[PDB]
């Protein structure tokens, strides 16, 4: 098993997650338009999203437990997919944050 061979599938699964729970797309676009307005109007929101980890569990438990137990192999594809989502919005690497129900962690 080598991580690179599964990176693409992990990317598209997190992309499907972000497409499903569209509140994260709305958050990305809200940050972008806030920053664009404040850049032009002459203070800046960061390129960071807090995902409810419960949403990622209810979507795909395997990927969720991947984020929890093997983040070194699961956060980079998730952040790549998020950066690609931000790129897909109209006109820098985006980062992730987590909330909820960590259990034994």
Partner 1 sequence: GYYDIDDVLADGTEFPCKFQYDIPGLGYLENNPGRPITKNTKLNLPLWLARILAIVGPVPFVELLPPDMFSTKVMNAIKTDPVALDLHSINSHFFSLAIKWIMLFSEKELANVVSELLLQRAQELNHHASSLSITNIATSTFLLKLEEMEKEIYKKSHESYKDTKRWMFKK
| 88 forms part of the interface with partner 1 (CB under 8 A) | no
9 interacts with partner 1 by CB under 8 A: no
**Tokens 């992730």 label which residue?**
96
Residue 52 burial class via C-beta count within 10 angstroms: exposed 0-12, middle 13-18, buried 19 and up: middle
Does 101 bind partner 1 (CB under 8 A)? Our answer is yes
Task: Kindly provide the b/e burial profile for residues 59-84, where b requires at least 16 CB atoms within 10 angstroms of the residue's own CB.
Answer: bbeebbebbbeeeebbbbbbbbbbbe
- With binding defined as CB under 8 A, does residue 102 bind partner 1? yes
Candidate segments 11-19, 34-42, 49-57, 89-97, binder of partner 1 by CB under 8 A = 49-57
Q: Verify binding: residue 71, partner 1, rule CB under 8 A.
A: no
Smallest gap from Cβ 53 to partner 1, in A, equals 8
Dihedral of the alpha carbons of 63, 13, 8, 85, in degrees to the nearest 10: -120
Q: Cβ atoms within 10 A of the Cβ of 23, count?
A: 13
Is residue 54 part of the contact set for partner 1 (CB under 8 A)? yes
Applying CB under 8 A, among 57, 59, 60, 75 the residue interacting with partner 1 is: 57
Task: Give the interface with partner 1 as residue ranges (CB under 8 A).
Answer: 53-54, 57-58, 100-104
């Amino acid at each position: 098993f080598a991580p690179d061979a599964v990176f693409g599938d992990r990317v598209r699964r997190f992309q499907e997650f972000l497409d499903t729970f569209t509140s994260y797309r709305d958050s990305v676009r809200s940050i972008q338009v806030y920053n664009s307005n404040n850049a032009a109007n002459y203070n800046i929101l960061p390129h960071r999203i807090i995902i409810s980890l419960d949403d990622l569990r209810e979507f795909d438990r395997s990927f969720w437990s991947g984020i929890l137990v093997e983040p070194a192999y699961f956060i980079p594809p998730a952040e790549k997919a998020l950066t690609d989502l931000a790129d897909s919005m109209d006109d820098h690497p985006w980062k992730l944050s987590f909330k909820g129900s960590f259990g034994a962690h």
